[model samples]
Target: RSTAKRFISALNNVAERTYNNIFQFHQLRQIAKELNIQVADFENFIGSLNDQGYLLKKGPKVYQLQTMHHH
Candidate 1:
């Protein structure tokens, strides 16, 4: 799979669950590293949907978020 495509796909899966809360987002980044999902491209790849996490940031690129209830 194309590197970008792979990262994008992975982040999409991550979004489905990671965005459920806030702090989870930060830890999500760390966990992603553990999973070998190319955190190097994470910042760039996130532009597709990831808005900078944390209250201090402004961008939360919420492409297709499903509120609360798990899918």
Candidate 2:
């Protein structure tokens, strides 16, 4: 899937599968694993979304939704 798709997918995955408001790449991987989504190339996916400012780090492994365009 494309980065935009992955960003949306990640958002949905978190909103639907997670109980916390904060998460990291590891959590993202876990969520993807539970959904049977391949996570081996997650770095590339992350990089893409990050480049687009859709995902950003708030701290080590901590990330927040980028506020570039308000989704």
Candidate 3:
């Protein structure tokens, strides 16, 4: 069970690896895994970020960091 803050942390990592405003699910999952985060909990994390306007869905399993610049 990840909180809003935890979800933001994961979103930050994904922002670093975005491609055309999108990121791979595995990439986001891998980062979370390294932080000892469980896969099931990631759904909550991602959902939280989406609700907060930090991310958007690119596809069923893809996400994009919302920003004007890459860095």
Candidate 4:
């Protein structure tokens, strides 16, 4: 595996622990920036692991994860 893999997994984890397991535009861009990588390609890069508990785009800027909201 590569950082590419870790990248999506990282995003997955972000949403996994967040409200409704959804990540937002700001988080997406900033997270990528924090990793110092490309936003466009790396986003497509997420497609690689889309089948898993990855972030699902369900809003103008929000990414929904495979999981649901916590109590």
Candidate 5:
């Protein structure tokens, strides 16, 4: 619960500043690193976010913010 909240906050922090609100897998990992979140944990959160409609996996290793415009 609280962990999810923190992950969401971190996701928002990066999403708001990312170009096209999209991030590659490596970039996502980097964000997790910068936020001090473990890779395994971040990956788990990614799935949760997708399920929650906060993120969309557009293609292999590519994720985009569901609320943002995509090309």
Candidate 6:
């Protein structure tokens, strides 16, 4: 859905601005609330990102971004 796309876009923008690619779920939840998006939808988005190898779940509601490696 277009709405989901927008949410993913916003998340990507925020993630890029973060140092070490580490993020807290509470922070994302806050942003989602500010964006008028549902918490469940945001969680689903994060799940997809993890599934795609874009990030790894470090702990409860915590995530670390996967970096590209050169061969």
Candidate of highest TM-score: 5
RMSD of 5: 3.8
Model 2 worst lDDT run, 10 consecutive residues: 62-71
- Looking at model 1, which ten-residue stretch has the lowest summed lDDT? 53-62
**Window of ten residues with lowest summed lDDT in model 5:** 62-71
TM-score of each: 0.36, 0.57, 0.60, 0.54, 0.66, 0.58
What is candidate 1's TM-score against the reference? 0.36
Candidate 6 lDDT over 1-71, as tens digits, reads 56556755666666666534677877766766777876456677778867877668889779776653223
Q: Mind giving the per-residue lDDT tens digits that candidate 1 earns over 1-71?
A: 36445544555566566554332345546645666766455655444444432212234532333233346
After the best TM-score superposition of candidate 2, give how far the Cα of residue 37 lies from its true spot, in angstroms.
2.5
* Clashes (N, CA, C under 3 Å) per candidate: 3, 0, 0, 0, 0, 0
Across 15-64, the per-residue lDDT of candidate 4 in tens digits comes to 55654466676776677778877655655555554545455667656776
Worst 10 residues of 4 by lDDT: 45-54
**Ranking of all predicted structures according to TM-score, beginning with the best and ending with the worst:** 5, 3, 6, 2, 4, 1
In terms of TM-score, which candidate is stronger, 5 or 6?
5
Candidate 3 lDDT over residue span 1-71, tens digit each: 34445755666655666535667777777766767666556776777778878778888798887765556
Question: Per-residue lDDT of 1-71 in model 2, one digit per residue for the tens?
Answer: 56357556667555555444466878766765665666557777766667777677777576675432322
How many clashes (backbone atoms < 3 Å, residues ≥3 apart in a chain or on different chains) does model 1 have? 3
Q: Residue 50, candidate 1: how far off, in angstroms?
A: 3.0
Please give the lDDT score at residue 55 for candidate 5. Answer: 75
lDDT, candidate 4, at 13:
62
Give the higher-TM-score candidate: 4 or 5.
5
Candidate 2 ranges with C-alpha deviation above 4 Å: 2-7, 16-21, 67-71
Inter-residue clash pairs, candidate 1 = 51-59, 51-60, 51-61
Better of 1 and 6 by TM-score: 6
Clashing pairs in 5: none
Model 3 score (lDDT): 0.68
lDDT of each: 0.46, 0.63, 0.68, 0.62, 0.71, 0.68
